[PDB]
Every structure is written in structure tokens, then in C-alpha cells.
Amino acid sequence: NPFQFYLTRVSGVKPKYNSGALHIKDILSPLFGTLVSSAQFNYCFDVDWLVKQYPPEFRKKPILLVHGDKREAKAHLHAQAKPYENISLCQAKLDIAFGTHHTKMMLLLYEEGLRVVIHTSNLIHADWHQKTQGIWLSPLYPRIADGTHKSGESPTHFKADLISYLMAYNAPSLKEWIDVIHKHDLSETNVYLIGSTPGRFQGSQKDNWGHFRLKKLLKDHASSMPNAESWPVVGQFSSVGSLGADESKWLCSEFKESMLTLGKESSVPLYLIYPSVENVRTSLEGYPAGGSLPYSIQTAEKQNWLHSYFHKWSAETSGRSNAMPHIKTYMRPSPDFSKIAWFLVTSANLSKAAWGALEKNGTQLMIRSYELGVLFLPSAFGLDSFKVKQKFFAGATFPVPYDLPPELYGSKDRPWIWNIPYVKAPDTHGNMWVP
């Protein structure tokens, strides 16, 4: 398949729903390449678990862990890694308050070439067990031949853009990976990189990151159709940030404005998919899945206007309605949801920290965190749109992993709010939630 977009395997679904899914052990297997060194960009790590996911014959190859931890959190990560002489650590600089390193990426250097994996899962057992997570697998990139005079660049500019993303860390261990990427031919890449890095971006640099990056790509490489105002926007995420006192403060003024861009010329329905309390309670994990669905009561009660946009998690199409989402996706379906104009899988949740918030009279985009995703545009595949994969077939599509159209919350539903108790009905393991 051309998209190379995969879900993680889910323990408990019938085999039909895992056959085209990937476990971390599959990604790292010798069949994917003969590993010589890897970099693991992530947020949370279980180092003992992680090393066991590599094939035994590769467990002593160098591993770089790229993380954002500080102070005692950083001390705990170093303590986890110290038994493994081959593991080095790179602490991503986070010079803006409340910033985090959320990017999930593997750089896998092989004897045969290079592979890039951009995904949504932490490097801990629970994130690959019973959650809905997304994976983009790059091709095996070959080394550029000696005396060849190739850029190795793709029509999507992925090679330069990935190097640009790495340069933002200003890290010597990542300059080593930049030099590796320079040596490889990434020209087959058919996705666009969309990253966020911490900073305050002005002028030209405004288009490099966050939701302005998305807007620029949609302006440059998508075309606007008639009736485009009827094509909804869908956002699907596992955390909700503080968005302001009303939808005009950020959600519909700059976030939706970036996401509704199509083409270069100058009322759109907005669907937000986020697990309800009932979604979480009846999930495979039960209430403990809500430990990975951060939405504070303190934030929620200041933006009740938001919840009228909320739709339940439903994923019959991939057998994953009870596998809570830690994937984040954004897309532009047609009014009947049979086609999409583009699809994005990313780490970025529905938050200003991840996507950026305009400052200084609209002239500066401020981003707190590292985020990373990849954008699927029909034009990159010679197509005008993507047909949508669904559960029902009457009888070759983009594999949207959840059901369309999204289903509105019922009047008795509530968004999952992780730091209040739920003691009225037990979860699938027989337990309540008392935070």
C-alpha cells in the first residue's frame, strides 16, 4: 500500500484487526533491516522494556534516547539507562515554560540504508498493548552512491524538512544523525513533515512550524473545490488544552482558519473526537486508560462551550472502539464523509502549546513543545482526493482508523476528565476511578 500508515497491534481484538497492524517488535525486527544504531525520540520511556523490544542480536548497538525531562525526572531516566553501556541520552532544550518533548520518532540506521518511523506511542508496555496508536513507516532509504551528485530530496522536501526539525535541537548527538541523513536518498518520500519546536517565530520562520506550517502546505499543495465551506474539519486527540473563554480566542480564529485552508485563493463544521467517560469506562483498559487522556477539571470548567463540539470515540472499522486512542489525527472529509482532502497523523493534541498561538499583534507564532507528524496530500500520490475506508462495503482507500461520520455525545455523556472520581459504575476490570 502507498501510504504505509499502520495501527499498533491491540491485544484482545480478533486476528482480522491485527493482521495489518505492527508491534514495536515487528518494526525493530531483522526483516526490517540490519540495525547498526538507532535514535528513539519520545516522551515517556521504560528502558528495560525498550531494550527487550530490540532483537537479541541488536540489543548492544548504540541507542540515543531523545527526551525532554529535567531535574529529578531526568535523574530517573539516566538511572534507568545506566545499566546499558550502549545507551546515550539527549535532553531536548525546553526554554519556554510548560513545554514538553512529545515527538515520537525512530531513526533506524541499517547496514542496508536508513528508515524513519514517525508514530504516536510512548516507549512503555501499556502504549502498545490495548490503545489505538498510529505509525508511519518510511521506505528503506538507500545510501547515496559515491560520486553521484544527488540531493536525495523528495518532491515533498522531506529530507531538508527533517534536517531542519533536527537542527532546532542544537544538539551534537543529533548533528550526527543529520550527517547520516545527508548521506541517504530520501527521494521516494511521499508525505510532508509537520513539526513543532519551541520558540517565537517571526516573518518567514512563521511558516516553518505548527499550524502555520499546516496552513502553508495546504495553501501550496492542495486545491480548493466548490462547496468547500461544506467540507468539515475533523480533529481527534487524547488531550485538551486551555483554549480560552470562547471559540473566537484560538479554536476558530487561528486553529480552524489554518486547518480550513485549501489552495492559494481566498461556516465549516468542526468535529472534535475525544473519549467520553463511557468510552473510557467500557474500554479494554478500563478507567486506567484515562491516565493517558489528560483533561483537567480546572481547565474544562472554564471552557464548557467546547464540549458541544465533542464526538465519541468509535472505531468499528478497525475493531478498535474499545482500544482508547492515543493516536492524534486531523483531516478534511467531504460533506458525506466518503472522501478526504488530506490526512494528518501527529503527536499534537488540541492545545496551543502544541500547535502554536499567535503573539505580538499576529506577527509571531509561539510554540512551547516539540511535536511531529506527517501529512498525506492527494497530490503527492497523483490523486485529487482520497477515498475513505469504512467498515461496510457493498462489493483501494485511505485507511482512516475510526468511524465516519463521528457520533455526537449524548445528553448524558461527559468528556473524560482525568482528575475527578468516577464511582457510579465499575469499569471492565471491576474498578472505580479515585484520583
Q: How far apart are CA 309 and CA 295, in angstroms?
A: 15
- Per DSSP, the residues of 78-112 read HHHHTT-TTEEEEE----STT--B---EEEEEESS
Residue 224 or 239: the one with the smaller Cβ distance to ligand XK6 is 239
Check binding of 292 to ligand XK6 (CB under 6 A). yes
Residue 197 or 351: the one with the smaller Cβ distance to ligand XK6 is 351
Active site residue 182: no
Q: How far apart are CA 125 and CA 297, in angstroms?
A: 28
Q: Provide the β-strand partners of residue 8.
A: 22
Residue 107 or 293: the one with the smaller Cβ distance to ligand XK6 is 293
Residues 119, 129, 184, 326: which is the catalytic one? 326
Q: How far apart are CA 130 and CA 146, in angstroms?
A: 46
- Reduced to 3 states (helix: H, G, I; strand: E, B; else coil), residue 200 is strand
Check binding of 154 to ligand XK6 (CB under 6 A). no
Q: Which three cell numbers stand for residue 50?
A: 525498550
- What backbone phi and psi angles, to 5 degrees, belong to 64? -105, 125
Is 328 annotated to bind a ligand? Reply is: yes
Which residue among 14, 16, 71, 149 contacts ligand XK6 (CB under 6 A)?
149
Residue 131: CB minimum distance to ligand XK6, A: 10
Binding-residue total with ligand XK6 (CB under 6 A): 15
Residue 238: CB minimum distance to ligand XK6, A: 4
Binding to ligand XK6, residues 99-118 (CB under 6 A)? 100, 102
Check binding of 126 to ligand XK6 (CB under 6 A). no
Which pairing describes strands 63-67 and 35-41: parallel, antiparallel, or unpaired? parallel
Check binding of 239 to ligand XK6 (CB under 6 A). yes
Active site residue 157: no
Residues 67, 102, 119, 311: which is the catalytic one? 102
Check binding of 236 to ligand XK6 (CB under 6 A). no
CA atoms within 13 A on the CB side of 388: 24
Residue 139: CB minimum distance to ligand XK6, A: 25
Is 424 annotated to bind a ligand? Reply is: no
Binding to ligand XK6, residues 308-367 (CB under 6 A)? 326, 349, 351, 353-354
CA atoms within 13 A on the CB side of 207: 8
Residue 62 or 294: the one with the smaller Cβ distance to ligand XK6 is 294
- Per DSSP, the residues of 288-357 read GGGGGS---HHHHTT-GGGGGGEE----GGGT-TTSEE--EEEEEE-TTSSEEEEEEEES--BSHHHH-E
Check binding of 283 to ligand XK6 (CB under 6 A). no
Residue 11: Cβ within 10 Å count: 11
- What backbone phi and psi angles, to 5 degrees, belong to 375? -105, 130
Which residue among 294, 399, 405, 426 contacts ligand XK6 (CB under 6 A)?
294
Residue 109 or 374: the one with the smaller Cβ distance to ligand XK6 is 374
Which pairing describes strands 270-273 and 310-311: parallel, antiparallel, or unpaired? parallel
Stretch touching ligand XK6 by CB under 6 A, among 97-105, 275-283, 338-346, 372-380: 97-105
Residue 123 or 377: the one with the smaller Cβ distance to ligand XK6 is 123
Which residue among 147, 203, 382, 430 contacts ligand XK6 (CB under 6 A)?
147
Q: Put residue 205 in one of left, alpha, beta given phi > 0 → left and psi -120 to 50 → alpha.
A: alpha
Contact 100, 94 (CB under 8 A): yes
Residues designated as active site? 102, 326
Residue ranges for the known binding site for substrate are: 104, 328
Residues that bind ligand XK6 (CB under 6 A): 98, 100, 102, 147, 149, 238-239, 241, 292, 294, 326, 349, 351, 353-354
